[PDB]
């Protein structure tokens, strides 16, 4: 990871434990850390403390391999960006004054998605070109440019909760027929091609949330958080409530 070497990079930690580290580190103005963005690919999040309050600024990776906060200047890397903002707040509540370094012995938190992608890539090369051992590991180095991006976008397509060709009625039928537990959900595509539907049960009723993607390629529910992939979308709404009546929990059969 371009940020692994940075001592204030915490990897894929949630906002909650991110704020716990900033709290343990003194909550001084300009106290900051870096963590992986769970909504975008190759993106980061700048967690910042000002006036004893937490400020979280998404850093999304541009098409040309640079990094930028929305409506802010671009930088060649996380190292550069933090170096820049250390001397010019240029939008932030204040400059980055003191890095919230990882405790001794603690390394960046490995991400769920990145490990899933790693296994899917290795699985693709395995069944396609019939390779094993180091001969497979070497093939993954060269055969991970486009497919790495393709497997990420299509990760949901291989997931249990994803249903290939179900209408609203077909979904509601077996949804009830089961444990009827809260949070039991599923995902499915729709007629408008670039849209999907998130169906789940909560207490009494089957709810349905319209998912649409705006070009730039980012999926979202109207007036909701935007994701780069449907997999990240579903995984985000498992822990964070984020608008839903009830966060996702369990899945339906394949």
């Amino acid at each position: 990871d371009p940020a692994a070497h940075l001592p204030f990079f915490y990897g894929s930690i949630s906002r909650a434990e991110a704020e716990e580290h900033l709290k343990l580190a003194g909550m001084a103005d300009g106290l900051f850390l870096l963590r992986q963005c769970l909504r975008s690919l190759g993106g980061y999040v700048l967690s910042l403390v000002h006036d004893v309050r937490f400020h979280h600024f998404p850093i999304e990776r541009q098409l040309n391999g640079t990094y930028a906060i929305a409506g802010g200047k671009a930088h060649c890397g996380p190292a550069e960006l933090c170096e820049f903002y250390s001397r010019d707040p240029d939008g932030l509540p204040c400059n980055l004054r003191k890095p919230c370094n990882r405790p001794s012995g603690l390394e960046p938190q490995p991400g769920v998605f990145d490990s899933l992608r790693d296994a899917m890539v290795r699985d693709y090369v395995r069944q396609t070109w019939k390779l094993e051992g180091e001969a497979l590991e070497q093939a993954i180095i060269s055969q991970a440019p486009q497919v790495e991006k393709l497997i990420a976008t299509t990760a949901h397509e291989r997931m249990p909760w994803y249903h290939s060709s179900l209408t609203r009625e077909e979904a509601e039928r077996k949804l009830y027929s089961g444990a009827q537990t809260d949070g039991k959900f599923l995902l499915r595509p729709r007629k408008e091609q670039g849209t999907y539907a998130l169906s789940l049960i909560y207490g009494k009723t089957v709810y349905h949330y319209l998912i649409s993607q705006d070009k730039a390629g980012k999926y979202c529910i109207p007036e909701g958080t935007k994701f780069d992939t449907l997999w990240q979308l579903v995984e985000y709404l498992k822990l964070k409530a984020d608008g839903l009546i009830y966060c996702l929990k369990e899945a339906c059969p394949n």
Binding site: I69, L92, Y209, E223, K240, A241, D242, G243, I245
Partner: peptide, 17 residues
Amino acid sequence: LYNELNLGRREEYDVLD
């Protein structure tokens, strides 16, 4: 008949000026 999101419980991120 799609359900509107609760605009009051969306997770909010900060932005520049």
